Every structure is written in C-alpha cells, then in structure tokens.
Amino acid sequence: ADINIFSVASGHLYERMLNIMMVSVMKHTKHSVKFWFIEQFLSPSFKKFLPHLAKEYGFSYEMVTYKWPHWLRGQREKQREIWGYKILFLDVLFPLSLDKVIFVDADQIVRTDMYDLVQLDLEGAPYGFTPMCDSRKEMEGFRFWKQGYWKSHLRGRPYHISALYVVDLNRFRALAAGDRLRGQYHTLLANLDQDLPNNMQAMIPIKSLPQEWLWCETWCADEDLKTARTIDLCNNPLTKEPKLDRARRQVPEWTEYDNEIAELAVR
Ligand SMILES: O=c1ccn([C@@H]2O[C@H](COP(=O)(O)OP(=O)(O)O)[C@@H](O)[C@H]2O)c(=O)[nH]1
Ligand SMILES: [Ca+2]
Asked: For atom 15 of ligand 1, which residue has the closest CA?
C-alpha cells in the first residue's frame, strides 16, 4: 500500500477513537492504505468489526505479533507497556519489506492526505516528529522541556510530540536505531514514548516536521487549528477534561465519522 499506518487501541474509548482515526484517513486520501495492528492489543469486539470497516472504507490491514523480550525490563502498568510498544520495537514489529510506516495516535483526526507524509524528505534522519507547540502561552508552566534537564540536554534541538511520527524503516534498521533505543531504555522516562526519542536525538536524529503536522489544543493556539493537518486530543494537564468531551467539541468531523460508523454497524 502507498500509505502504511500503525496504531494501538487498548481500552474501549481508544478503540472507538481508532475507528474514527482510520475513517478520517480515508476521507482525505485516495491512495491505497494499509493499517498495521499489534495482535496482543486487539480485543474480540474490535477484531469482529474490523473486516466490515475494511470493506466499507477500502483499506487493507495486517496484524503483527511481537512479545516483549524476556531480557528487556517490563512495564507493570498497562499504559506504560502500550507506550513502550509505540517506540521500542520499530525494527522488529514489521516485515523487512516494509519501507516506511507512520504511527498515528488512536485519539486523532486526520485532515490531510497522509501520502504527503510518506513523500516528506527526512534528510537522512530515520524518523520524523512534530515539535511541541509554543503558541498557547497560558500553558508555559507545563512546558517541562523548556526547564531544567531538558533545556540543557537538547542543545537547541526541539522537543517533539510523540502522537504522530513517520519512520523510514530501512534507514532505522541500517542505523541499528532499535538496539540503541532499547539500550538507552535500559540505562534510563515519565513520557516513555516521547522522552526516549527526544533524549536520543544526537545518536538517532529526528527530522522536525513542519508545525502544521500535529495540532493539540493543550499546547497549540486556536488560530492554528484551521491550518492543522492532523489533530490529536492530547490530555490537558491543566483542565483534565475527558477525552470524549473533547472529541465531541473540537472538530465537527469526529461526530460525523462516529455517526457514519454507527450506520455501518446498523447494516
Ligand atoms: O490506555 C491507553 C493509553 C494509550 N493508548 C494508545 O497510546 C496513544 C498515546 O496515548 P494518549 O493519546 O492517551 O496520550 P496523550 O496524547 O493524551 O498525551 C493513544 O492515542 C493510543 O493509541 C491506548 O491505546 N490505551
Ligand atoms: Ca494522543
């Protein structure tokens, strides 16, 4: 497929949002699309519905199986285990033939042709992430990456949000980036999937994507929603507003797509 996207949904609401994310992709491209899912994180309900969604929305899909390695420190907390599956296994989840994959959070709405991201030149970096927004000024106290350890550590590199990233799997494998990330994970990560790649940039470069690639209201100004290519419903450490409430109000298409999926289910 032209576009290859990987995501995870563990939890009822994340599954509901993942179906919507997938629909949002298909509304904005006429390229071929394949979704990749990790077997362990597929529930019976989701697995049952998935082929219907595929026959309606015109995507293909494949499951990968990868057991957390015995020698690799585990995560007792499910949420952190999931975040680990996002980042620790990029060289081993997928077939060797797969050239490139894009990770998109389940709680996203896409508003762009994701082939644009497939075509985007990473300029030798094995993966690309969007910088955190600076624009919403009221949230400065929560921008921990501008404080203490991170300002010094980053040496002028951005701190990037891990909701969306494109991985040149060939370059990533050639650089042995997976072994390096797993080695650093052992050595050291409150934000496991985000702190790790941002910490390792000198060793494993990030291509900083243009800012429009990922908008989250937590960090980003209202005025920049209109030019956002994708939207993430990232948790807001100030308001603690429930994600479902945010999904209903943020952009009109979330409810549009949820309703469309509901009508598919009636059939
Ligand atoms: O209980 C969870 C927590 C996280 N995730 C997956 O991990 C991603 C990142 O976590 P989340 O979106 O909750 O983080 P935020 O963007 O809110 O900081 C989610 O979109 C899901 O794909 C999940 O499936 N179940
Ligand atoms: Ca998210």
From this structure: 234
